[PDB]
Amino acid sequence: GPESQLDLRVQELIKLICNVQAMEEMMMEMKYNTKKAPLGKLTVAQIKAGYQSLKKIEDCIRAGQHGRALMEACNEFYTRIPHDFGLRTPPLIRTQKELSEKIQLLEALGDIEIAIKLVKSERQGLEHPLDQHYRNLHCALRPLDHESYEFKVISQYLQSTHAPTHSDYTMTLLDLFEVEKDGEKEAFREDLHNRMLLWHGSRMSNWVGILSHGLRIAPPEAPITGYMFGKGIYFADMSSKSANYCFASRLKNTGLLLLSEVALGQCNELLEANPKAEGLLQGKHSTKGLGKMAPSSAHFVTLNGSTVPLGPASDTGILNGYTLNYNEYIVYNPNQVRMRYLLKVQFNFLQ
Ligand SMILES: C[C@]12CCCN1CC1=NNC(=O)c3cc(F)cc4[nH]c2c1c34
Numbered sequence: 001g002p003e004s005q006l007d008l009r010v011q012e013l014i015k016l017i018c019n020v021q022a023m024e025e026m027m028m029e030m031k032y033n034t035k036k037a038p039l040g041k042l043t044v045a046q047i048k049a050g051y052q053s054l055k056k057i058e059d060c061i062r063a064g065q066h067g068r069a070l071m072e073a074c075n076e077f078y079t080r081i082p083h084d085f086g087l088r089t090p091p092l093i094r095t096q097k098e099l100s101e102k103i104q105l106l107e108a109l110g111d112i113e114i115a116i117k118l119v120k121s122e123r124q125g126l127e128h129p130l131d132q133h134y135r136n137l138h139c140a141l142r143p144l145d146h147e148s149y150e151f152k153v154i155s156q157y158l159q160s161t162h163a164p165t166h167s168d169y170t171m172t173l174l175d176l177f178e179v180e181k182d183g184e185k186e187a188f189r190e191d192l193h194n195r196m197l198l199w200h201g202s203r204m205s206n207w208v209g210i211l212s213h214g215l216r217i218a219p220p221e222a223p224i225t226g227y228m229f230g231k232g233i234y235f236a237d238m239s240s241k242s243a244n245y246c247f248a249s250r251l252k253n254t255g256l257l258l259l260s261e262v263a264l265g266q267c268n269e270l271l272e273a274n275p276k277a278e279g280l281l282q283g284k285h286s287t288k289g290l291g292k293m294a295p296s297s298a299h300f301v302t303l304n305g306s307t308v309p310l311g312p313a314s315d316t317g318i319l320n321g322y323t324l325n326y327n328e329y330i331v332y333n334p335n336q337v338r339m340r341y342l343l344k345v346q347f348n349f350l351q
Helices: 008-017 020-029 044-062 068-080 096-119 129-137 149-160 204-213 239-246
Strands: 139-143 169-181 195-201 233-235 254-263 267-270 286-289 293-295 301-303 306-308 313-315 328-331 337-349
Touching (some): 008 129, 008 139, 044 096, 149 254, 149 337, 195 239, 204 254, 204 337
Antiparallel strands (some): 169 337, 254 337
């Protein structure tokens, strides 16, 4: 029986992100019907059909259709993406937050299809499965020293930018990995100014796909009204805002946080949401949803050519009527993103 040749730290990481049984438990909590559509029978085409159904719902909403048209549009979606609501009728989809909820379900399902394809790509016996899964990611994950300057700034970044409204939990940095996805260095825009180290969170089910395919842009079939600032890659400067998207629980209190170098260039700053913000760029390179509270430049430091927006965060007075509490950074080409650090985090829930 071939033993693992990977670092014990990387071994634990792959086990976490390749746990298909944990993936089935997560999708059921999202009301997805795994009995009716098993995860091992997921296909790219089925997920794309779900996106197009949501786009059809957005067409009903734009046309003011809240009757049979909307019900039949939602029925088609729930038939392609089956849910488990008991004996109840499936809820209708209408609002942006309800659209986004389904978009996030589809994004998890898409990355889950990548994960099953990967674990099924194991040639059993050849070597330990963990080493096989790791190589098939085609993404380097190098564990770093806890007395390294990297670990010091990133631990500071994690604690200093924890938002006061997200007071239901704290976060303990368990481990830190340097990330090198094949090709990101060669496509990155080292020319663009305002290179910043920004957070991004996601459910545990999505990290095989993220580390295998990079942060991606929403597909053309998706309705644009589900993305507050358009079909781009979203980042935060407040760790807890991204860490909320890990969707950790008291029993599943381990999550992953990604730090990436983002070439924002000149930002197009918006006071409120607009799903069509990409057309408002006008030679600018990124959209910045202005938040009321943000880190101040008086605490910033540099870590390997990028600016770390360390806390403590102060208020900006932004009060345009739901304004953003905290910032949001959106780039619309993946060549502005380079994944760099992966954080294994313990969530400390405060009851
Ligand atoms: C709901 C949404 C819209 C596009 C993908 N979705 C998932 C997401 N995941 N993760 C983050 O760390 C994040 C950080 C932000 F500052 C804003 C964000 N908006 C999103 C995310 C997000």
